[PDB]
């Protein structure tokens, strides 16, 4: 039988989601199973669970981010530079590889979207505008990003059937860790700057592997290795949401752990 909004809200409350919480979900819809009115049912359940004073923050990115095509160039190649659509936060679809639920979050009425085309975050709730801005090129997941404000706002990570590699907030630990040899990438994004398309070239920490040994195309990256160690060592609320095994993680706690994990292992 497909899961109803009411059943999912009960499960989320049993897991520990409280009215007023600040939640960042990572969702595998296949693990959840069938939903009364499709994925919107889970979106509706999350909003009801955090209540009218709570907030949801999601890493949605952009279906058509030209990351691969501009990576490692000092400027966008001529072909992509002339024809690539500028990032339009109001209409740009979410990146499907990070979860099919994110397109439903970002089109939710009142949802705010951050300005970073590749690292775009979406937020719902009274603190949404404060969460999503600023989000500047060069500050994808580190200090001054929405992730940083999420961590300072008692954020909780809600993993619904997602694996330990999916914990975006741990890229903040990579950004701030005092370790040698940190990898950086250069890429270009097409922004809308008062109506006109402008290409911006920036560098930032490599979110596909902060060090060479975490950068194999098949992982495990540092996010995954940190999260596995953390979950083996920490009491974490665990339970079902629909058919999916779910966890509710204190975001500040796992990031602090990840900073220490990286700094203990790399001089
Ligand atoms: C939309 N543009 C995207 C661009 O943002 C970036 O995505 C990163 C992403 O794959 C990382 O997730 C993968 O990590 C690894 C091992 N590296 C394999 C499986 C995933 N867990 C995530 N942790 C950080 C993301 N920024 O590279 C790909 C891209 C499609 O170009
Ligand atoms: Mg508030």
UniProtKB/TrEMBL annotation:
Q: Which residues bind CoA?
A: 26-30, 100, 171
Q: Where, in this chain's numbering, is Mg(2+) bound?
A: 127
Q: Does the keyword Acyltransferase apply?
A: yes
Binding residue positions for acetyl-CoA:
26-30, 100, 168, 171
What organism, scientifically named, is this protein from? Enterobacter cloacae
The catalytic activity, as recorded, is:
a 2-deoxystreptamine antibiotic + acetyl-CoA = an N(3)-acetyl-2-deoxystreptamine antibiotic + CoA + H(+)
Tell me any Pfam family this protein matches. Answer: Antibiotic_NAT
- Gene Ontology annotations of biological process type: response to antibiotic
Key words of the record: Acyltransferase, Antibiotic resistance, Metal-binding, Transferase
MF (Gene Ontology): aminoglycoside 3-N-acetyltransferase activity; metal ion binding
Q: Look up the domain of life of the source.
A: Bacteria
Top-level EC class: transferase
**What PANTHER family does the entry give?**
AMINOGLYCOSIDE N3-ACETYLTRANSFERASE, SPBETA PROPHAGE-DERIVED AMINOGLYCOSIDE N(3')-ACETYLTRANSFERASE-LIKE PROTEIN YOKD
Give the protein's function. Resistance to antibiotics containing the 2-deoxy-streptamine ring including gentamicin, kanamycin, tobramycin, neomycin and apramycin.
Q: What family classification does the UniProt entry report for this protein?
A: Belongs to the antibiotic N-acetyltransferase family.
The family database entries (InterPro entries) matched by this protein are listed as: Amioglycoside_AcTrfase, Antibiotic_NAT-like
Give the Enzyme Commission number.
2.3.1.-
Coiled-coil spans are none
Q: What is this protein called?
A: Aminoglycoside N(3)-acetyltransferase
